[PDB]
Symmetry: C3
Subunit: 110 residues, 3 copies
């Protein structure tokens, strides 16, 4: 149902970044194609971090993979094999609620 | 300074057009269902009815409390009853005292 | 390398009006050892403030930090933020790669 909120514990968002839009578009499509994510979002960002001792500001693409706990490990292993960085950003968030309809769509897609 | 929070919520959803996001944002805040809404364009790749679609969408992030969340979620779905929108709720673990207070006072 | 449950990593979220303000804050936070990484995303924001509903363009900021630096980043940010009442919302990731968790902790 489209209007009922439910508590959820098995949904996961995995956030990473890559340098170019072509890379991100390729990773997103390949993850959905492989059944490792139901949906992947990309948005351009600026990132500031220290590298080789100096502050760097770089344009990057922030990716959000929407997946379940059951595919999370396989997604992270797969990304490490395909990610262009030696040491990719990798943070996982847990949604605590969703709609029944969206949770069902997500699980069905995986 | 920081305080641990259990009752604040961020509702994340997507809509197809910028005009819809702007209208929803305004009306949700006007109604006291959210205190603040942010909108960010994104490109999304997803599985829909077997196939892979790539679309530009507006990511919306609504700042609310657990008390208004069910109401906000239902209201949003009433505005695009044809769609099956992204609905993901996050819970912040902390906030400032002042921000938490402003947010709560903004809801109706 | 593999995923590991995390309890000590934090994402502090805030907004500022302009890209220049965002860049300056980000750089200073990193330089001061209060955050490991800062991301900046252009957004539109709708909120209730000063008795009205405004829509403005803003920069969304996400500070990557640990719990050990969080109080100090928050205190510092309060003194340096251009806004009267800064957005202050903290998220906790539930996992990360071993390498990235180690990078983040090590960078601070």
């Amino acid at each position: 149902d489209l209007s009922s909120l439910i508590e959820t514990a098995d949904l996961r968002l995995l956030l990473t970044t890559v340098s170019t839009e072509v890379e991100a578009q390729q990773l997103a499509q390949a993850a959905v194609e492989a059944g490792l994510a139901a949906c992947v979002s990309i948005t351009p960002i600026q990132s500031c971090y220290r590298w080789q001792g100096a502050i760097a500001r770089e344009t990057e693409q922030q990716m959000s993979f929407k997946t379940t706990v059951e595919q999370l490990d396989a997604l992270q292993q797969w990304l490490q094999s395909q990610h262009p960085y030696a040491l990719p950003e990798c943070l996982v968030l847990t949604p605590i609620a969703s709609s029944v309809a969206y949770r069902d769509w997500l699980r069905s897609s995986l």
